[PDB]
């Protein structure tokens, strides 16, 4: 609704990566639903579960109808084919949905959603107050300005003691980094099991007659292309999340200093925000510094004295 | 619209879970419409209604053309296949639309829809009132505030007589819990009955010539995957519903305790709500306490007296 | 628009049942147009136009190619398969469309649509006027109050002589009831006729060589399930329609005795409504009584006297 | 826009019949594009270019491979199948598009579209004035009423010169009637021609060996059902068009005798509208007469007299 | 949004024709990508690379398997089918997109889009200004009308030097006429080259054994139908384009002879617009002359003198 | 939003070329997913692993059933076909997506984004002001204008010291030119490796019997058509990008030469903009010069002085 301003730049690359993951997931899924077949032929000469590889040339007769071929194709497709070759689109679709849910649960949780909406509402009211220009460069605007002043005071009293949003943003990025590490741990290890050629040895003699078969999975090359693209793209995602975790654990976003604003505004009476509002204003500062610049005048008591003097006279 | 206030955190997890149940339901349904076939071959040697399992190898002939393979496939699909393997996506689709209808019958019933929409209008009027900023710490505003006071007084007089919302939410959550209990009661009993290869015996010798057949159901592994995922999802849904039922049966939702804000807001004359209105105030408090903070000053005769003094002056 | 307040609860359950019906209708239609198959085999030994049921086992050779099988499938699909087994989704789609048209013809007809929209506009205007709170408990507001009194008197003179809305809303329900009766009286009679096993005898010897054929319709069980579900759902629809028709012939909706609100408010000089206005006022009372209760003031001559007195002083 | 005022009730039934016509057209079209096959077999014993119909039973061997069957199906489909069976959905698609274009050409033509939009703007402003209440039963309202009076006078002097709206409505309804005559002229004549059993004699002996063939067309019954449904829809559409053409040819909508409303409103100074505005006022009367009731007071010389004396005092 | 008033009547028929060209193009394209095959048979007796047409009837045996038939189908589809039968839908799709680009480049170009936006904004203020009625038949209204007077005066010298809009609207229509010319030269000369019977002699004897084949393209009739429909639609489009070209070369659109308003309105002093603004005046005159009628009072020095005297008094 | 003000004519042609690139990419992609088959036949007589090309004729018998035909089709399609014939739609889709991301990174990056909406906000507010006409031709307008002088002075003091927008808009165009160089370098080099006829000698003798095969790729002509169309589209894209890069490198884009307008606007005290704001002023002047025309009056010292004496007197 009104959360568009509260997203830093690392949550835009995250959004586009997470939507292209979903589109390649549904592409692989509709491919595997569409065909994902296997073509298998029996080997006449066998030497310990291996095809022995033994006027004009003529064809080789196997004495099999089409439906025995279908049966052995299904059986060799299930039993002697790796599980990663079959359900990889479903795995990446599930992981994409878990990434999306982990990204948007912070917004959709009502306990922090209320605080976010309240903060962005008073931020828009602070930005739209015309008295900032007179404070930084008569009466009725005095009453709307004092309405802003005491409701900003009420908000500062209301949200200072909390510790919830910073903890949520800790846990979200922590589980995102851990899940990225697990995905890279298993995917590159199991990606080599997809291959065009596969040999099944099922021991179903009473239905066909032969024992070992030579199969051919035709979608293996395209699935390897999709898997390699997915791995490289989730490396990019993991580096982005690692950088934002390092930034948020390095800048010590619990508390906010406010020296660089008072040094230019020459308002010597300004306090420092303690926690859970300092981090939120750090986030809007990483959006831009000007929105935090115009939030300065609604906290100085000398600005309050100037406002009440202009109201009285 | 503005009904997001009226939903706690346990009623958006329910919605998201219902969406993902509906997606897996429609995916299983379109798969079952798309193929859901099976491949059946006759066993040449039969022992106790089971297949006996008995220079170069050559294929086994059956002297059966393709169309009577199609016939025996259809017959052994319709007769000797367990019905849970066939209609599981339709079953879970039916269950998720029952869950959606139960979760939205609270809002779509007009006798409660009117009460909630008028309550939302009253609360947005109370929240948007500028006089609460003065109250928690000038004639037309006072008259508008007095109109607000009289309208919330008659609204309180109106909705205190009912008891419909609390009992509907009771009879909604309890049937959601019993639906969860029955779903888990039967689907884990029947989930073991889907499998890849199945032996069918349908007694058609006048048409094919053989008696018993060995079949293969190629979608069994993926349907078992989807069924296990659905069972785990139903478990998490049921734990959420049992938690909210325990909360509503423990907290004694009918009455309101309001002294906890009376003692700090210094308005020693506030009443205790009887039923069907204190429950909704508890629900808004479960969203956030601040909307209940701003509703404190609108029900106190000292506050109407202060407004009367201000209107006199 | 805002016509949701103009539909009772027995026209919302109808609106959901009659879209579930369309959903199962389009599902059955796409299934029937997608598969549309039945598999047929010839019986070599025949008795009374039924199949006689007569080293290792070997297949039975009919010496037919695939295209003869296709031809006999088409012939036994049309000539010896019952029409209810084929066009049932189109029948239920037609019934659902006629039900929806009968439900919304009342709204879409302009001669009553004008009365309904101008009615709901004056009720919304009477709801939103601020003088109602003062009257149930400063001259410009009296001017709009006098204008609204005049237009309410104009409405009362305008709509008191008609009967078209009541006549249409009774005729729609009675033809819905008779439609429900027709649907149940043929569908449960013809629902037993679909089955998996069908025998066809079509007299084509000059083309294939055989006389009678044993067939198989694989969609029979799913179509029977859909038909039974449709019958139960139409039964629920008909019960709702019977209830509302009994309500209309019970409560005698032509006139409205308006005693309770006048006794509660002590405005003893109020008249009763003749017809075609009491109907919509009964409907909005079935929505909620407060819209009618706050409509009481704009008809009372003592309320007119108080309005002109407040205009005078 | 808000053109629902400018549509009589017979243009809504038309606008829904044209939708269901489009629906059956697109359904028949997609079914025909999907299958529309026909299965052909050769007759071994032929007399006078017709199939003569001359221990256990055995099949009849033609010694033909599948791809020749496909060739003879294509040939007997393209030559000896009547064109009404093949192109009926495309014909009805073209027809319903011509109905939609003929319905909306009266709106999309700009020379009349400007008059309709400016007319409906004037009627909404005249309907939304509070001065007509006083006219039927303080200075700036008189001034804006005078401005609206001048606009009404300018509109009356402007549109009194034309005839184009009535001319176009003639030219639309008469060609709708002619198109009805043409459709019912040929379609009921040709509808018997589609049928299931179809014979062909295409003179291909050098490629197959046989001369005549017997064929089957498995969609013929469904196409006959769809054609009958389309015929009934055309009949209903044409009855509606005949009724509205007859009504508008007998009412003589060029001029309006305005006597019957001011004989009871007691505003005797009213003229009769000559052309192109009386027809539009009859159209909005067929919507409802109250809109022209509230437009009647804004044209009376005694009404400007009362307005300007109220401006004087 | 409100760009519709700039479009003449011939630019709307052009738009709807371009829509129906697009839908027939996409229908032909989806049909061609769906099937577009042909069925080919070899003929045993050959004369001049054609087939010579030289106890019961028996079929002809060719000893070709299905995959050889598929190969010869592919070869005779690619090498001996005319290119117009294959790429006609994509060709007409390209032509439709070119026509749409030629009709919307006049809007999407910024140097003319800004001028059109300024023209439509100034004409809507001139339509909504209330001083026009008083001129053709209070101090702040006259002052803002003076502001609009000077804005119109500066716009007049802002647009009196250009020619870009007229140049672009000339060039677009003349290249559309050129494109119609090219379309009519090639498509009627090439439309005769599709038919049901096509011969191929492709010289693949080492793989099959036969030399010449006779094929059957089963979509030639429907493609001929679509091509004839497209040809007639193109002819109608071109007649519209020739009409607007003749209108542009005949009516001398560069300057406007504006007197037809001034002898009617007795405003004896008015100038003649020279170029690039009189063209826009013609363009809005083709919509309706009312907008040019109301623009006269915002361009006459006697009208600024009257407003100046009125603001003085 | 209204951000079309920022895109010149070369930035709209680029977007339309990109979207038609995307539709031809997805068309080729869905076609390749849908069929992309290849039909292969063995060659009986072999010379250097190539086909030797050697009463009525009869077919050549290969003694191959359909399933090993499918196997050899898959093997020859995977091993002995160039990868550009198979992954061209995926490649061009990737290039289209990276072009779109490169084009929209200038908007989606927040550090420059915020500067863009702040700049466009002050530009629309300057265009919306009514005092520019008075400047280039009562007192609260003077106060509003003074406030907007303070706002534009704040904008000028803030955004002037940056360079990031100019740096990013250079870096985007340079990599678009680099991508053009790469695409034209490799695509036309590899475009000739798609062909109708392909020979595969894949050494599968113990499964089929033959050694060399002749194949036919039925999509090669359509893929070559699409490739040529894509190359021409890339060429147009690259000429547009090279032109705008040359304009950017040549026209000394960093600083504005504003003195050409102060002689006619008679405000000689206007300075030249240093950097990163003159880029935006060029980028709006490319749209239209009026927005820069009426931007002189809001920054000139004599303009604030004339407003000062207008407020004083
Ligand atoms: C085993 C002896 C058969 C003899 C036969 C003759 C043809 C020239 C030599 C003998 C007839 C026939 C029909 C077929 O269609 C069957 C339809 C299956 C396609 C479904 C999916 C798709 O559409 O792909 C197929 Cl596939 C073949 Cl192979 C053959 C032949 O070989």
Author numbering:
A (entry chain F), B (entry chain A), C (entry chain B), D (entry chain C), E (entry chain D), F (entry chain E): 15 to 68, 92 to 174, 233 to 408
What did the original publication write about this model?
SWELL1 or LRRC8a (leucine-rich repeat-containing protein 8a) encodes a transmembrane protein first described in 2003 as the site of a balanced translocation in an immunodeficient child with agammaglobulinemia and absent B-cells. We previously showed SWELL1 to mediate insulin-PI3K-AKT signaling in adipocytes, skeletal muscle, and endothelium via non-conductive signaling mechanisms.
In Pose-2, SN-407 is tilted off the SWELL1 central axis, positioning its cyclopentyl group closer to the hydrophobic cleft between SWELL1 subunits. However, collectively, these molecular docking, cryo-EM, and functional experiments indicate that SN-401 and SWELL1-active congeners (SN-403/406/407) bind to SWELL1-LRRC8 hexamers at both R103 (via carboxylate end) and at the interface between adjacent LRRC8 monomers (via hydrophobic end), to potentially stabilize the closed state of the channel, and thereby inhibit ICl,SWELL activity. Moreover, we hypothesize these SN-40X compounds may function as molecular tethers to stabilize assembly of the SWELL1-LRRC8 hexamer by binding between R103 and adjacent LRRC8 monomers, potentially reducing SWELL1-LRRC8 complex disassembly, subsequent proteasomal degradation, and thereby augment translocation from ER to plasma membrane signaling domains, akin to pharmacological chaperones.
